[PDB]
RNA sequence: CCGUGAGGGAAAGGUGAAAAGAACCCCGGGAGGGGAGUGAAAUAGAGCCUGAAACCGUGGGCUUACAAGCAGUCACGGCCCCGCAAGGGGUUGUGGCGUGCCUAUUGAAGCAUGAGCCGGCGACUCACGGUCGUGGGCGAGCUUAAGCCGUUGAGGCGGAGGCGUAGGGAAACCGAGUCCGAACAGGGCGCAAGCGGGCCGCACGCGGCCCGCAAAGUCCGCGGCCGUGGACCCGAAACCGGGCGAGCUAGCCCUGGCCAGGGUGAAGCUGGGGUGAGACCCAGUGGAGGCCCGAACCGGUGGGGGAUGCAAACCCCUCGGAUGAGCUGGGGCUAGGAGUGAAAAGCUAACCGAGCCCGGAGAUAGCUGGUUCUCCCCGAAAUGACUUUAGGGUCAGCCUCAGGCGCUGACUGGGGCCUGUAGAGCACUGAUAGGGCUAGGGGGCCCACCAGCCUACCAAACCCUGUCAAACUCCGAAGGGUCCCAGGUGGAGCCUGGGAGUGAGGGCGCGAGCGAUAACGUCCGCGUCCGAGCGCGGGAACAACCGAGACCGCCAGCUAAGGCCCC
RNA sequence: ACCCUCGCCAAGGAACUCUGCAAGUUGGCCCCGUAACUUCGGGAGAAGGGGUGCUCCCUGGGGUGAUGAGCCCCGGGGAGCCGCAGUGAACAGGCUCUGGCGACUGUUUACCAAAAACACAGCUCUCUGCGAACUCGUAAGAGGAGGUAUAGGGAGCGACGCUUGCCCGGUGCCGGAAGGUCAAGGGGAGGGGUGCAAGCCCCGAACCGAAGCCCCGGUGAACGGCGGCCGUAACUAUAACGGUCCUAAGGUAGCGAAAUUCCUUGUCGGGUAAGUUCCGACCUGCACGAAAAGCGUAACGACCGGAGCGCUGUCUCGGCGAGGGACCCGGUGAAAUUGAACUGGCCGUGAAGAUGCGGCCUACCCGUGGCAGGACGAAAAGACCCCGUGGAGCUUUACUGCAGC
RNA sequence: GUGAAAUACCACCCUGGCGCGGCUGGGGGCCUAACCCUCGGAUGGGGGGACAGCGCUUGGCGGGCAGUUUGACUGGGGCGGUCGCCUCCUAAAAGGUAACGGAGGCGCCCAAAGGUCCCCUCAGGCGGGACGGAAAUCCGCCGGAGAGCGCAAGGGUAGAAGGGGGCCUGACUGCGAGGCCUGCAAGCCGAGCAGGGGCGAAAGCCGGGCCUAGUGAACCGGUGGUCCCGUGUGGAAGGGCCAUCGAUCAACGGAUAAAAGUUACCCCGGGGAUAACAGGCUGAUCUCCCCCGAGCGUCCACAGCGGCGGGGAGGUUUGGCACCUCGAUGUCGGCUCGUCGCAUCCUGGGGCUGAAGAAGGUCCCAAGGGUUGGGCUGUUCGCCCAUUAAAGCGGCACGCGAGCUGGGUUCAGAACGUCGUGAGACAGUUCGGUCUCUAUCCGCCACGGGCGCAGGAGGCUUGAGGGGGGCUCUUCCUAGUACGAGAGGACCGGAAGGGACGCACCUCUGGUUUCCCAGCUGUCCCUCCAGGGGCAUAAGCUGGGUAGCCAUGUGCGGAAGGGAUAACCGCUGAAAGCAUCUAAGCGGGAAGCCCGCCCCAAGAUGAGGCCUCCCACGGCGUCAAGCCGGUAAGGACCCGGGAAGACCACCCGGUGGAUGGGCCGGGGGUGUAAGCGCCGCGAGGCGUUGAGCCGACCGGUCCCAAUCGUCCGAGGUCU
RNA sequence: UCCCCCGUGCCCAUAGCGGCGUGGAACCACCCGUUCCCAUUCCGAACACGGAAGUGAAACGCGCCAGCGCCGAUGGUACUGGGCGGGCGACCGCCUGGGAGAGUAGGUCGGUGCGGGGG
């Protein structure tokens, strides 16, 4: 029998996964309410007809269609055009 | 029958209508038989109706001493037996193929569990509630309970009462509304039920009778599941109550008994010495003692033997005590958290860390085991979250059934983005070898403070050449995700409800961690098989490797993997 | 064959083995003669020897008679005889030296432990003033005890000898009229509910209210604690000597690799040809120490160690003999176990150890006496281990109660 | 003047103390009459005495007792660590994703670090700069963000979320379309409407904070409001609703308001879901060999060695894993009995040597056979003693407990040290402690029975194929010779002895010999003396002792010899005009291999061979047995026996006979019988006398017994 | 329509940085002042106001260059959906789609709408 003393760790815990990310992709329809994106900072901007939460999270206030534009250094947006 | 006792507690029924129960003869000591006789029957002949199976025999048919096996099965052949025949029955000589049943498991022929064999007993029920479903009755309603009257396998009556017809509010309360609110803002519960439709009074009107069974419910029957009950059956170690036990053992009380023979020779006495008397020294006597040796007796030291024993503690040899804290008969007392204990938790009626019996009692058992007829359709899980949770559970995932919805499913084509892995690359964060240049610092020529000069040492920052990274990224695929439009009629999908089981997984491939890039290792990710395909072919054999998804039959055909010299 | 119980054995003589386990040796009686040590009783059966039959002769005591004979009972001296052998058979200690542990005789785990365990005389502490304390019991009552401090109860140690240090901080026990806190109850400034009111109901601050804990003193043959760390003497080492502290204080004597020593077969010495044991020492005591006593101690022990002598079948190293079984016949006639069996070897393979798969090898059918490697042989639903929100016994400054005070 | 502060006088009061008095408490003392205890029985006398006892109630102490609690994870469990939340990675470019994987944080804080309006832009690099480090604050360029943003990390960010200033409190109330996330409930984003506000000219922005941690369901209660309910009525008490409070319920989805240990005195239910043994997988560790050649070896890498490092094999170590076995796979050491491997301790062959010889070293070939006795410890192992040719290393469940032992270890007792308040405990010690007559199958050793072997018999045989056995030392002669300065000292060949071992044997030596002989004791008996018998073991004791069986005793054995080979050494010889053992062909060469030697053996169904015997159909089916009863050669049965033997078998006899028993002779053992005679008082001693008795052995002799008989068994299938 | 300038957006480096031109007629800026509205942590620097002598110096606008920055092929690899194989292993190969990053050739000192003033 041997089972020498066995050491020990500590850095064994993690945080909770948020499931962040991209909810609504150009394209698709949203009802004003709709959080499309969901970041933590402000890797995407709010464009026309989109509001940012207290966690820059994005949201839909126009019942009408998505999509992105890339501004280059000016960050990426993401405006939900009206179903005109 | 068992136990001292409380108490436990069996087994065992059948001649025949009628004893008519077998006179008598024969073998025999008898038993038992053979005749005779009774009877419808005696293989109804006496523990006798019927009398199965295991088991034991006698006779016959086939067949066996060079073969080897989960005992069979498929194929021919021989012998025997049926029938006219075709055909069939029994046996088994060769050949081919073949890893018991149950259980439990990731996995069993397994050298894991259970079973000697046969027969008989042996486990998902019942009551009342609840929830679905279903066969009926009546339905803006339905229905009685106790009890009463009747029957004597006759039903009636009985509206107390219960559900249902209004939802809201914590409530007062209001009401198709209501609750929060100041609010006709909002919002949470709420409601908004006709008719597919024959007929027909026979208004050029459908009334409304009718209808499914609803608006819509109830009642009764049936079935599934749930709750409370022992709630599928068997099983604890234990807990508690009332009793029975000291004829075993422990301790004390009373009253009686037992201890061959020897050995040793305490104190005392007496005598002789002794001295001034004494002490004291000698003998002698004496007969003390948890004294000695050793039978009885009481012990149980070592060894052997015994080990389904002579024996649930024995036998043999050898040992301890043996006038004592000794041994022993009879009569008595103390007991279950209690007794007793020269103290081992010993002993308390052959298992005492808490006696035995009966009772609570069918204790509880998230554990183990077992769970019995047939066929047909579908068919899992071994994951996640939480759990005094981790071999147990609740919800979800996955299975199934009923009803509803009807192209929405998996998969695929075309668009649009979402992303930072592979790879690569140093621009960031760090790591990097050498070289250049160059703050310093050893230190060096030193004209000595004013700098200075040199240095195959140390050495920043910075540039050049070479690289390194899961927690680096200037960059970045393949792919993947999702939405839209299209294909796609599948034991696809979606919605509502009834029943689950599963929450130990395993091997292989690939992508990571751990490990020591060891493990039939371990932990995740996708996939796939096994599981449940220990069904079939290949791989010598072999759950998961290659082939391939077994409804049944065929003395037909083409293939797969793998093969084509013999086996 | 083998097993039991018994007999003998050449040469050796413990080389056997955990161990002289077993067996043998020795064994009664008489006479010589016996060591250390000692509590002067012992150790004494210490050891070590010698004698032991029978015949004849002589002779002394006693008991009974009678003082005599007989008959009994103890002796003393002489000669001689025969065996391998004279307690001629049976009953019948092997001895010694040295350690440990208990004093001694004794008691105990009925059925694996007889002991260094219990007990024990003796020592100390403590309670009890007698309706004693304590024990049983609800109570009455009873034991204590028809006892009374030279008694009882409880506790530890355990003859005897020399002794039994240091620390009272904490726990316990004894004593304690300062103080802190604390129950019921008392007391009621003040406030409340209702009544038209008298009222009737309540709440409630000061303050007064027991043991208890805290506190203060004592107490060690009360529970206990006695670790360390620095400095220091005519090499070196050591430290009589000083200092230090979270605690209260830091091991007095005596013992010591011990029933205690991890390192360890410590290191010296002894005994042996050779010694992890043993004996005597040293002291680095991992982790002795004074009454859960320290250190000794004659005697005692079916206790445990180590050595010698003796003698052996223990062994080298076996042999033969005997009897009771085993074997065969007649009689009688079990058992655990058992899925069924038509039950072989090797390499493999397989849930990792197959008579049962594969390939090969071997192999006529059926018994009888033997052996014990396999059938993961039998027996017991592993006593170890883990699991179960299983169970019991026991402990305490775990919780919560209760008796008792 | 001193002091912090001033004193004559005047007061209001405070501190503490003493008196006399109300309010409330304590503790004594005396009394007797309740209660208690006592006196030769007492309506009474003593003693205690309102205490004690006893009732109700307060608080206390309280393992003496009772009921219980003492978590989970976990590469077994325990010990250690951990348990909720946040950031990054692992995570395979959506989301998610595990491990006792890698690395860090949270259990707060801010009234300005909040709302809004208006301004401002950093860090560093290089210059130049009073104290000025290498960053204080300045000035000038250059500098898109590397600074800053309360704290971890990440994302984000100057077109501000950063830095400053002004008013402010939206760190609102009533709501809340629509979503993210998700098992449950929780978490999260939030436009927009209303009420009443803040800042801005206005557009507008404000329902805390750049963002992601800073947290806790329910239950039970507290405090404000509510006016909702309030037990006949009214009011109250008490609830409800709204708001808010008390959680290291941190084991962080939270069992009770309330909880630790121990068991070797232990018990049940389970598990090979899970540890200890053995096996398995693996091979880090272990053992072994190989590659490189620093560098040692006087010189010289490789005689012998081998730095740093590298590649392997084995599966005997210590482990890892947790795969069969927990309805049981007995565990260390010894004994016994073997058997295998070779990585060889000895012995046999051989190469190189820093090999003169002798003795070594090293490597290659080679297990055929060997591989000692003791002291110590339970030991394995080791250390010693004395030897040896050597005192090999491993495997077989660390071989072997239905084979033995039980000394070590692991049950109950006891003690030491030590840990613990304790009960108890300790890979610490110490003494003690029940290891189960029966073998069914396989396997193994032996012995039979049946049938077969294609006529039946009685003999003798061949040997396919198995098994046994294989050892080694010393001395002498070659020759004190080759070699060697010397000391020492061989090969090759040839002898004689040993040791262990094996088979057989009993002449000898030495055992045993259970009644062969003698001697002896006690007792009972026959028959009194004498002479005898039983018993004192299953021999009473003692001394002897044939056959048989035996070792300590005796004789033999290992071979010799032939053949093929290992390493190794060559001949001839190309490819490659040389060289080369190789490619073709040929040799030499081991205790090893084959055969030789001893033993078994034709169930060698491949059933063999040789010699000799007896042979016929006689009655009867499918006409050579497919058939019956006598037969034949022969064979059993039965009997007498046996150095044969458990039984069976095998061997020898059976009256034509020496088989056993007896009798006779001889061996052989006892060691002078009885009786009688002589001497002695007697125990005894002479003599007759090597007498008597007398198993097995070597033989004679039909005296007794193997009387007499019976039953099987050919008639022999094919070109 | 066409050049120049003034405001404004889009594209977000081939849209810039840095050198070298040049421009003021107009617009713009610098300036002249700062009594007044308004100001600075202190400065009219910056905001702000009233102006108009001088200027293009600064700043800005418009050209020129490739050196830094940036952009960046084509080929060929890497890697990889899917399919099929090899090695004891560490790993690796063929088929079929997709296909980088670096590197090289080379490209660039912008393009462009709406409204104003002016030739
Ligand atoms: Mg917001
Ligand atoms: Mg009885
Ligand atoms: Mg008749
Ligand atoms: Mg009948
Ligand atoms: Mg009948
Ligand atoms: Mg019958
Ligand atoms: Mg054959
Ligand atoms: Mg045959
Ligand atoms: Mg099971
Ligand atoms: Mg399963
Ligand atoms: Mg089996
Ligand atoms: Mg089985
Ligand atoms: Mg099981
Ligand atoms: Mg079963
Ligand atoms: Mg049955
Ligand atoms: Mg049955
Ligand atoms: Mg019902
Ligand atoms: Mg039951
Ligand atoms: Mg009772
Ligand atoms: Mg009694
Ligand atoms: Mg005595
Ligand atoms: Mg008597
Ligand atoms: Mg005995
Ligand atoms: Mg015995
Ligand atoms: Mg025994
Ligand atoms: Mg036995
Ligand atoms: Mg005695
Ligand atoms: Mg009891
Ligand atoms: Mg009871
Ligand atoms: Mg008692
Ligand atoms: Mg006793
Ligand atoms: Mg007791
Ligand atoms: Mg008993
Ligand atoms: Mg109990
Ligand atoms: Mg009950
Ligand atoms: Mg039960
Ligand atoms: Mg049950
Ligand atoms: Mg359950
Ligand atoms: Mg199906
Ligand atoms: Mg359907
Ligand atoms: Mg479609
Ligand atoms: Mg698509
Ligand atoms: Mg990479
Ligand atoms: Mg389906
Ligand atoms: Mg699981
Ligand atoms: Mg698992
Ligand atoms: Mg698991
Ligand atoms: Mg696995
Ligand atoms: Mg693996
Ligand atoms: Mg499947
Ligand atoms: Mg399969
Ligand atoms: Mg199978
Ligand atoms: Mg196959
Ligand atoms: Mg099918
Ligand atoms: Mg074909
Ligand atoms: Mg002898
Ligand atoms: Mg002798
Ligand atoms: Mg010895
Ligand atoms: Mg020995
Ligand atoms: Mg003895
Ligand atoms: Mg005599
Ligand atoms: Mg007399
Ligand atoms: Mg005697
Ligand atoms: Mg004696
Ligand atoms: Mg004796
Ligand atoms: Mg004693
Ligand atoms: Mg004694
Ligand atoms: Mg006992
Ligand atoms: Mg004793
Ligand atoms: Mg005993
Ligand atoms: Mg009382
Ligand atoms: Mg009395
Ligand atoms: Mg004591
Ligand atoms: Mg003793
Ligand atoms: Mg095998
Ligand atoms: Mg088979
Ligand atoms: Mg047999
Ligand atoms: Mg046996
Ligand atoms: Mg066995
Ligand atoms: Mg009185
Ligand atoms: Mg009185
Ligand atoms: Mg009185
Ligand atoms: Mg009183
Ligand atoms: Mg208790
Ligand atoms: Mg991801
Ligand atoms: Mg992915
Ligand atoms: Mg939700
Ligand atoms: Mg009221
Ligand atoms: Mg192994
Ligand atoms: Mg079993
Ligand atoms: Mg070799
Ligand atoms: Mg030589
Ligand atoms: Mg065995
Ligand atoms: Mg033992
Ligand atoms: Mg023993
Ligand atoms: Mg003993
Ligand atoms: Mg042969
Ligand atoms: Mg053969
Ligand atoms: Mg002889
Ligand atoms: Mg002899
Ligand atoms: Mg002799
Ligand atoms: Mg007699
Ligand atoms: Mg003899
Ligand atoms: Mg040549
Ligand atoms: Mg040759
Ligand atoms: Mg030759
Ligand atoms: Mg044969
Ligand atoms: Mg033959
Ligand atoms: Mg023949
Ligand atoms: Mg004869
Ligand atoms: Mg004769
Ligand atoms: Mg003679
Ligand atoms: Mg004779």
Same mark, same amino acid.
């Given at each position: 029998?041997? +089972?020498?003393?066995?050491?020990? !760790? *500590? #850095?064994?815990?993690?945080?909770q996964? +948020? =499931?962040?990310?991209?909810? =609504? $992709?150009?394209?698709? /329809? %949203? =009802?004003? &309410?709709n959080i499309? /994106?969901?970041?933590? &900072? !402000?890797?995407? +901007?709010?464009?026309? #007809? /989109?509001?940012?939460?207290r966690?820059? !999270?994005?949201?839909?206030? %126009?019942?009408? /269609? %998505?999509?992105?534009?890339? *501004?280059? =250094?000016?960050?990426? $947006? %993401?405006?939900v055009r009206?179903?005109?």
């Amino acid at each position: 029998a041997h +089972k020498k003393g066995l050491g020990s !760790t *500590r #850095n064994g815990r993690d945080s909770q996964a +948020k =499931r962040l990310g991209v909810k =609504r $992709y150009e394209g698709q /329809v %949203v =009802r004003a &309410g709709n959080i499309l /994106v969901r970041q933590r &900072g !402000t890797r995407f +901007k709010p464009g026309k #007809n /989109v509001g940012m939460g207290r966690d820059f !999270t994005l949201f839909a206030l %126009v019942d009408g /269609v %998505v999509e992105f534009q890339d *501004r280059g =250094r000016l960050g990426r $947006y %993401v405006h939900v055009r009206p179903l005109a």
